[PDB]
Design a protein around this ligand. Structure first.
Ligand code: HEC
Ligand SMILES: [Ca+2]
Ligand SMILES: [Ca+2]
Ligand SMILES: [Ca+2]
Ligand SMILES: [Ca+2]
Ligand SMILES: [Ca+2]
Ligand SMILES: [Ca+2]
Ligand SMILES: [Cl-]
Ligand SMILES: [Co+2]
Length: 106
């Protein structure tokens, strides 16, 4: 999957998590979100295509997904213990990091 597909996976599973009814639905959504974020991390955003792959902007873009994965992992620990409401709250707090990267590179 390319970068925009990974981003659509993140956006879709976000809406899934807030509409979810049980911990299984939340755990499956977070697992796909983890893979999409790690896959997106290997991509180059169109706005940075004329920058070097080694540029500080590209490393900042990659580091943003490291932090996002950390939050998905923390939310995964909550969903694995049946705490769907806590997991839904954690998944809602991803949005501040979604927006912060987008303001720079989207
Ligand atoms: C930087 C480390 C990012 C974080 C974290 C998130 N997004 Fe993202 N997003 C990023 C870029 C550089 C782009 C543009 C890519 C392109 O090919 O144009 C996007 C785009 C989106 C989109 C629109 C997809 C499209 O077809 O253009 C959506 C709906 C989107 N992003 C959602 C999204 C969500 C829900 C995130 C948190 C889970 C998130 N993004 C994080 C860069 C980064
Ligand atoms: Ca891919
Ligand atoms: Ca697009
Ligand atoms: Ca595509
Ligand atoms: Ca698509
Ligand atoms: Ca529902
Ligand atoms: Ca327990
Ligand atoms: Cl709960
Ligand atoms: Co954070």
């Amino acid at each position: 999957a390319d970068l925009e597909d990974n981003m659509e996976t993140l956006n879709d599973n976000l809406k899934v998590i807030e509409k979810a009814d049980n911990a299984a639905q939340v755990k499956d959504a977070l697992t796909k979100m983890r893979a999409a974020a790690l896959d997106a991390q290997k991509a180059t955003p169109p706005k940075l295509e004329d920058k070097s792959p080694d540029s500080p902007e590209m490393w900042d873009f990659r580091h943003g997904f490291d932090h996002l994965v950390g939050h998905i992992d923390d939310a995964l620990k909550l969903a694995n213990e049946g705490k769907v409401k806590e997991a839904q709250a954690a998944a809602e707090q991803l949005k501040t990091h979604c927006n912060a990267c987008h303001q720079k590179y989207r």
